[PDB]
């Protein structure tokens, strides 16, 4: 860990201070975090991967098609990267590693990215490409945490598939492929076709297990809410705040979690 | 055969000068690396308050103490040099004195550099913690004092090794 | 001199072992910073191991001072076998000391993490640190055997 | 002389290599042991044992050097240097055996103790697996010093 | 005089490389078994076999090393310089063959643990694969012993 | 003189290198075979063959080393430089060829495990590739054998 | 004198380098063939052509090395360092040329196999490319022949 | 004297380095040509030029090596260090020039393969750059001719 | 008497290093031009310039090599010991200068070819940069000539 | 004898090392200053401490080299291999110490530039840190001067 | 005897290192100038200065090399060891200093070219920084010239 002392100490210290500082309103908090990241602009690659995921979200918003520019402006500039329809997806593919996989999944551009079910697959492919970009950090403990989070997201996607997207006619092989090393292989949760049967298998996944617990809200939900408790746990993983490593992405995740908590509080 | 017999012969005065100088140089390099680490830490946390700057100043004081120890070692080695006549610079006793001086310099400078690097890393972490928690300052000073004590122990080792030379 | 260089290296190897254990001390202090960020009592508890590690290096310095006191070569003439034996034994002791210092640094980081958390197996962490310190002490003691193993 | 020099070099190489491998294994296993202990204090007591075992194996490897110090006897009659080179070889073999087996034991024990958080019986299994190679490490380290002491006859 | 020192060094290399191969095998097997026990603790016993094979290879290497170390007395056996170098060669070759066999056995053992997580028929096949891999260590030990005997034949 | 020392060392290097290459190839083929057996037990049986094919190289290297060791004898001839040098060079060539062939065989074995998982004619092509690799190994062994047979001095 | 050392070393190096290059080319060709067979088993049959070319180049290098080695007859000609140096140079050049040609031909063959799986005329294109690559092996063989002749030119 | 060790080494090195460089360049060009042929057969037909450049470089290296070898006339020319030194210098220059030209030709071939799909005019223009690189290689070979002719002073 | 070996080695090395540097620069410039292709087909004239600079560097290297080879005349003024080492020094200087110039020219030419597609008004600046780069190779050739000049005096 | 060669080599190594260390520190500090000056050009003008430290390091290196060169007076002293070896080693150590100090100071100033861009308090703090680094460099220079003085004896 | 030959070799290495450093700096400045010209043609004209500075450093190195060459004079003194030693030391020091300064100035200019495009005000300070960087190399050149002036080593 002497490399941190040799170089990069100041940036790591600034990132750690920004992380420890943070424990409508959500949009304002995300914009403040984006401004802090821009002022700041190893751990930098992890923060870039987190921003790449947050920009995959905004690109999937923009790849489709309604005041889309206004919607992108309302989002954080970290999520709505300034650099950034088939042409829209192709342009988003540049400067964003996550977008081209979303374009590949969405063969019909906006049509194959419908917010009902198709946009879920497009965003899943975008998240897979963002996870590949994170893996391009040559591994690490933070890379291990990112892999665990990606596995949780894949398990949530497979659970939501078997729960509701069967009516959306997403193929079981395709849905498993849509639901994404650890995220890549989730045959245990895809073995059970029944929604009730597949929910238990998805909860049996180590990211989902021991975190969801009763899971009155979470695993029962569709989209990517099955690992909601695991997301809070991964936020608590950053609460360790072990130094001499890359935790800028952890800092961004903690700031986003704080913004989400502030939004959930809303009035009072 | 012939090369094996040749390898034995060496010039003791060159080794004595190397022991006099390279140890101080390496100690200076280690202190510089520690000071750079401390400065990076201070730059990281300069936003809040200069208490972390005071801690980094304590670390720099430890580095300066290491530098003073190196200077004292160099002065001693200047004094500790044996008679070693220009003509009489081939005796086995002169070689033994040179080997002892080189060993003293190696033990001094390497330990000083290691202590300086340790002090720099500890001071960086301490400055980060002090920026985090205002209360935690005496604990940081404890680690700084530990690094300074390591440097002082190296200096004392050099002082003990000062009386080593046996050259004619 | 070849025998003088051999004995000097025999001592400087344990000296370098102490210098390497100083790196484990630095790692322990780095972890102690984060540990004491949570609480000042944990700060003192983690800082104490750093002081102990520094005391280990001070003891190594004292051993080097004793070696310098005994460094006089007129009393004992060392041949090729004696110099080689001294150098080899010293190098083995130094390698053992450096390995013990690295293990002590790792254990100190783990104990700092534990102290940042609740006490829990603080006794077990202290036991692991004591095991590392015992390995270091065993190396230091084995050094004395080779130091005294000289002459005809 | 040459024979005592080589014999002592090999004897010290025994201790150095065995200690290095044992300490690498100790750190590897101790990472997982600390992980399991932080996970639960109940598994902490069980997972603590492999670290102590690795430390004891390293201590035994280091102590083997003290015994091998009498393996080569410069004060005794100097035989051909090839006997001392044979002692050197025996010591080097002991050191490499200890290093390799200790490193393997610790590498296995890393994942064994780390996974012991889920199942406490995994701690017992990991202890057994680690011992299976730690015993081989200590045995090789001791056997090398024994051979170094024994082969000094030189007819 | 050049013979016995060289041959002893070859025995040292034999022990060193056999230990390194057994180390790779044991480390990989333990790493795989740690994950295997989490899935099925009952299946952990079956996966222990590659560890036993690696230990057997290491024991064979140590035995060959002790055998080569035997006979160092110049009067005991005739040892011309090329003969002692041939004994060194026997030791080094057997050790290196055992090292490579051990590394391959470790990789195969990790694969077998993965297959044990899969259908047990794949594990049964991987057991035979591991046995076939381990046969290489015995072949290398036999070759080393034969060459050491040919080295013993000297004038 | 001391050349037969170098010749015995070269024979040992031949054995060690052939064994190393063969065992690396066998490990790669075993990983591929484990993957195939996880995929399909039908592919498991065929995927065993490359491991044995690789181990054949190690067996041949051991046989060559034994032959070379039998070649060295003081009763057969007095110590000389040329014979020992030739034996050492032949052993080195044989061992290097065996190691290279084993590495290629392991790579081809992994590729052929994947191909057999794909299609049976792909498995036949993989068998042909393994046959070509074995032919290369045999050519190297024959060259080494001829060089050893050139032991006149 | 020492000329047989150099000659035998060159003969060994030729075979070693040729085998390494053939191994690289064969590995690349096998990867390409597996990819083509997965894509289309029928097209896989023609894909073996680059592998055959690489094997032919390797055999030609091996044959040249064997021919060069067979020329060395100590009873035929008295001790002259010129013949040994020429043989060593021929072996080194032939081996290096064969290795480079094999590696390049393997890479080009894998690319051409992928392209042939894409389009049919790409097969003819890759065949032409491999024919172009064979020039390196041809030049190596010519250089080896020239050096073998210079070996006899010694006086 | 020491001339064979120098001259033979230079003759081998020239061919080896030239073949290695030409092989790397031809491999890069073949990969690019396969990509172009997948894109369009016309680009595949056009992309033959880098292969021609690589073959020309290899032929030039072989010619230089042949000239150097023919320069070796020990019966006619007394053994001088200068005579072998001239051949060694010529071989080193030829080999280095061949390797550099091969690397540059591979880069240019990949670039032109991209350009052919991009635009036929771009490929036509890049032909000029490839010709310039070939001319630089020819200049190096020509300097090699002067180096070979320098051997005339020795006899 | 053994100096001519060093002299021939230096003479070969000068040309070898110059050719290597020129080849690297030419490859870089060609890749850059091909990238600039299609988008700016009219920029063929601009893309020609770096190839010209690389050719000039190669020609300078060949000239230095020819001069060095001409310097080596053992028939008159026996090479003694200074001649071979002087030739080696001159050859090494020429080759190193050529390699440095080739690398710099390749990098600058890649940058210029990239700048060629958009805003071609900087063609004059690109040519100026290329000339400033080739000035280094010219200085190296001059230094090599100056070194070769002193060769004759050492004979006495 | 060969003592002047050793002394000249030592002085040259000292000068080269000092120049390289000063260049590295200056490059790092200048890159940091240029990066920081993008936001507010007003703060950039104040950022002259990197130039000051670079000039100080260069001047110290040049002075040390000049002092070492002056010590080489063959007419004054016939010199000895011992004296030349001592002087060369002393000069080389001084140059290496200066290079290390300059590199560390430049590394610190790299972040100090951004710190100054943040606020003036961080600016004066980085100024103090650079002052401490320059004091260490001056201590190394004084050590080199004392060593050169010893060479006279 | 041959010591002044080593001195001349060091003198040539001086110019070699100076040219390498100047080329690196010029390449960095050229990349920056290309970026600036892409931004705005007006900034490109003002950005030529660092390239001229690198060229001036290279010319200074060449001048130092020419001075060193003038220093070598057979009629000055007979074969002497110190003449080669001092010249080689001066050349090596000057070349190393020039290369380091050139690399640093190249990095600084690469940063400054991008910086000036956004804001023209900082260009003034960038000019001063580059001037200081070049002045360091000038001081190093003067130091090297001092050693060259130190020629009368004997009598």
Swiss-Prot record, chain I:
* Cellular component, GO, one term: proton-transporting V-type ATPase, V0 domain
The answer to whether keyword NAD applies is: no
Lumenal topological domain residue ranges: 69-87, 148-156
Cite the record's tissue specificity text.
Expressed in leaf, root, flower and silique. Expression is lower in roots.
Bilayer topology annotation: Multi-pass membrane protein
Which residue stretches are annotated as topological domain Cytoplasmic? 26-47, 110-121
Q: Which InterPro entries match?
A: ATPase_proteolipid_c-like_dom, ATPase_proteolipid_csu, ATPase_proteolipid_su_C_euk, F/V-ATP_Csub_sf
Query: What protein family does this chain belong to?
Result: Belongs to the V-ATPase proteolipid subunit family.
Instruction: Supply the name of the protein.
Output: V-type proton ATPase subunit c1
**To which species is this protein native?**
Arabidopsis thaliana
């Amino acid at each position: 860990a002497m490399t941190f002392n040799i170089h990069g100490g100041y940036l790591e210290a600034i990132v750690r201070g920004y992380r420890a500082g943070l424990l409508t309103i959500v949009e304002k908090c995300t914009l403040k975090l984006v401004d802090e990241y821009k002022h700041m602009l190893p751990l930098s690659t992890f923060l870039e991967y987190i921003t790449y995921g947050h920009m995959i979200d905004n690109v999937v918003l923009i790849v489709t098609g309604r005041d889309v520019q206004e919607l992108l402006e309302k989002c954080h500039p970290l999520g709505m990267f300034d650099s950034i329809m088939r042409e829209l997806y192709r342009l988003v593919l540049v400067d964003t590693p996550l977008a081209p996989y979303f374009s590949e999944c969405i063969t019909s551009e906006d049509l194959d990215d419908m917010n009902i079910e198709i946009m879920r697959n497009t965003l899943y492919k975008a998240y897979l490409e963002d996870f590949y970009k994170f893996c391009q950090k040559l591994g690490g403990a933070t890379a291990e945490i990112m892999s665990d989070l990606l596995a949780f997201e894949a398990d949530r996607r497979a659970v939501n598939i078997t729960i509701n997207s069967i009516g959306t006619e997403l193929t079981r092989d395709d849905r498993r492929k849509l639901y994404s090393l650890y995220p890549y292989g989730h045959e245990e949760l895809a073995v059970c076709e029944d929604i009730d049967q597949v929910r238990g298998v998805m909860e049996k996944y180590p990211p989902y297990q021991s975190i969801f617990s009763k899971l009155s809200y979470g695993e029962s939900q569709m989209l990517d809410k099955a690992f909601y408790e695991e997301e809070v746990k991964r936020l608590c993983l950053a609460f360790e705040q072990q130094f001499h490593y890359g935790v800028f992405f952890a800092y961004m995740r903690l700031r986003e979690q704080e913004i989400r908590n502030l939004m959930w509080i809303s009035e009072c | 055969s012939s090369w094996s017999r040749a390898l034995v012969k060496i010039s003791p005065y060159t080794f004595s000068a190397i022991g006099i100088a390279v140890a101080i140089g390496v100690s200076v390099l280690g202190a510089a690396w520690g000071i750079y680490i401390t400065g990076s830490s201070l730059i990281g946390a300069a936003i809040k308050a200069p208490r972390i700057t005071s801690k980094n100043l304590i670390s720099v004081i430890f580095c300066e103490a290491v530098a003073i120890y190196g200077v004292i070692v160099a002065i001693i080695l200047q004094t500790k040099l044996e008679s070693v006549p220009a003509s009489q610079i081939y005796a086995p006793e002169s070689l033994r004195a040179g080997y002892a001086i080189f060993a003293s310099g190696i033990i001094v400078g390497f330990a000083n550099l290691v202590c300086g690097l340790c002090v720099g890393i500890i001071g960086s972490s301490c400055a980060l913690s002090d920026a985090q928690n205002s209360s935690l300052f005496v604990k940081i000073l404890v680690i700084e004092i530990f690094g300074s004590a390591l440097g002082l122990f190296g200096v004392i080792v050099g002082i003990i090794m000062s009386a080593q030379a046996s050259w004619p | 001199t070849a025998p003088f260089f051999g004995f000097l290296g025999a001592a400087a190897a344990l000296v370098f072992s102490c210098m390497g254990a100083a790196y484990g001390t630095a790692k322990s202090g780095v972890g102690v910073a984060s540990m004491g960020v949570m609480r000042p009592e944990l700060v003192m508890k983690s800082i104490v191991p750093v002081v102990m590690a520094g005391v280990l290096g001070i003891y190594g310095l004292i051993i080097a001072v004793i070696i310098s006191t005994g460094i006089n070569p007129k009393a004992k003439s060392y041949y090729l076998f004696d110099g080689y034996a001294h150098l080899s034994s010293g190098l083995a002791c130094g390698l053992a000391g450096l390995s013990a210092g690295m293990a002590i640094g790792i254990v100190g980081d783990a104990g700092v993490r534990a102290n940042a958390q609740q006490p829990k197996l603080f006794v077990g962490m202290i036991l692991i640190l004591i095991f590392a310190e015992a390995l270091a002490l065993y190396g230091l003691i084995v050094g004395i055997i080779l130091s005294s193993r000289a002459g005809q």
